[PDB]
């Protein structure tokens, strides 16, 4: 790397990894479009395994930027609308609180409150509609934002099912191999099990256990190489050669609601630049009233691109700023406090630009 990306980073990392007691990490700056890539410590202590620029590291709800951009490419295709009732897609989903929760509540964390969590008991496809059958909303759509796994999971659910392909299926064939991401996986495969890193939990080796929609809300692995790919490919859509998915970023970064100064995109989150750290900030619930903006402001370039992730042993980040052509990914595997996250992404992106 050029020594001003080096020193940036090596002198903002190097004392978060010793704070944070961070057993692995890997980061890429994209910068003026390219990428530049950054590995320190361990993908598996006990085996003594480093990370490289090859090794998996569990994304947590970074996967929701996957499939906020595959819902947005369905709905490009004509698939699907975001102004359609879950029903249309769900028809067996009869409870009368169901009535006005649109696919865009769903994607957006809207539809009044859904449940952090799929609870654990929640396995099969019966269960799954008894669960949301019964789920009794505390607001009404469009009113308050509660960040959920069940909201954004049913969302990548529902959209794919006009495709007639599995979500996994969807997500590789109109996602993962026209951008060249050829080791990002929803179920890692035997031949990539050398590459995927352990996370670290109170010093237990774990990884993420399967639930249901884990797929759709929390379940993509990832390289580095390949996550600054993915912010190439975000930070420049327009530039990617087919059509659907190329409307699908940019209705990923699109502007549905505002709360303070956050707005929330399909997947990502997005606030004006410039912006400060304290401002783009433990919290197992925190439910915040939404006002809409009508209609949706399309992509904005001077924007603050977002988005952190957590699995039990995992920690990762990603932000962007397309009017800079500047952007991050840091992928560890501990989950370290997301304050820590932002002010080092900040603190590398502000150097930059």
Do not use: C
Request: zero cysteines; glycine letters at 8%.
């Amino acid at each position: 790397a050029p020594q001003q990306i080096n020193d940036i980073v090596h002198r903002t990392i190097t004392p978060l990894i010793e704070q944070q007691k961070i057993p692995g990490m890997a980061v890429a700056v994209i910068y003026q479009g390219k990428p530049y890539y950054f590995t320190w410590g361990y993908a598996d202590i006990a085996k003594k395994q480093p990370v490289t620029q090859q090794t998996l590291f569990e994304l947590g709800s970074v996967s929701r930027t996957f499939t906020g951009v595959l819902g947005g490419d369905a709905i490009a295709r004509g698939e699907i609308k975001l102004s359609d009732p879950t029903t249309k897609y769900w028809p067996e989903l009869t409870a009368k609180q169901w009535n006005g929760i649109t696919l865009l509540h769903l994607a957006t964390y809207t539809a009044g409150g859904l449940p952090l969590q799929v609870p654990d008991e929640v396995k099969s496809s019966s269960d799954l509609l008894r669960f949301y059958q019964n789920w009794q909303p505390a607001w009404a759509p469009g009113t308050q934002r509660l960040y959920a796994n069940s909201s954004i999971g049913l969302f990548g659910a529902l959209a794919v099912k006009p495709s007639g392909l599995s979500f996994e299926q969807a997500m590789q064939t109109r996602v993962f191999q026209p951008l060249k991401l050829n080791h990002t996986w929803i179920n890692v495969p035997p031949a990539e099990e050398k590459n995927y890193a352990w996370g670290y939990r109170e010093g237990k080796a774990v990884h993420v256990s399967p639930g249901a929609l884990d797929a759709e809300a929390y379940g993509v692995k990832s390289t580095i190489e390949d996550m600054a790919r993915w912010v190439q490919s975000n930070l420049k859509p327009l530039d990617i050669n087919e059509k659907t998915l190329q409307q699908g970023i940019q209705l990923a970064q699109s502007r549905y609601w505002q709360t303070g100064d956050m707005y929330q995109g399909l997947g990502w989150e997005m606030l004006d630049w410039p912006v400060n750290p304290d401002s783009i900030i433990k919290i197992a619930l925190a439910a915040r009233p939404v006002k809409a903006i009508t209609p949706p402001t399309p992509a904005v370039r001077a924007s603050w691109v977002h988005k952190t992730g957590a699995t039990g042993g995992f920690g990762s980040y990603v932000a962007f700023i397309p009017e800079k052509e500047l952007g991050i990914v840091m992928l560890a595997n501990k989950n370290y406090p997301n304050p820590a996250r932002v002010d080092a992404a900040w603190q590398i992106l502000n150097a930059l630009q």
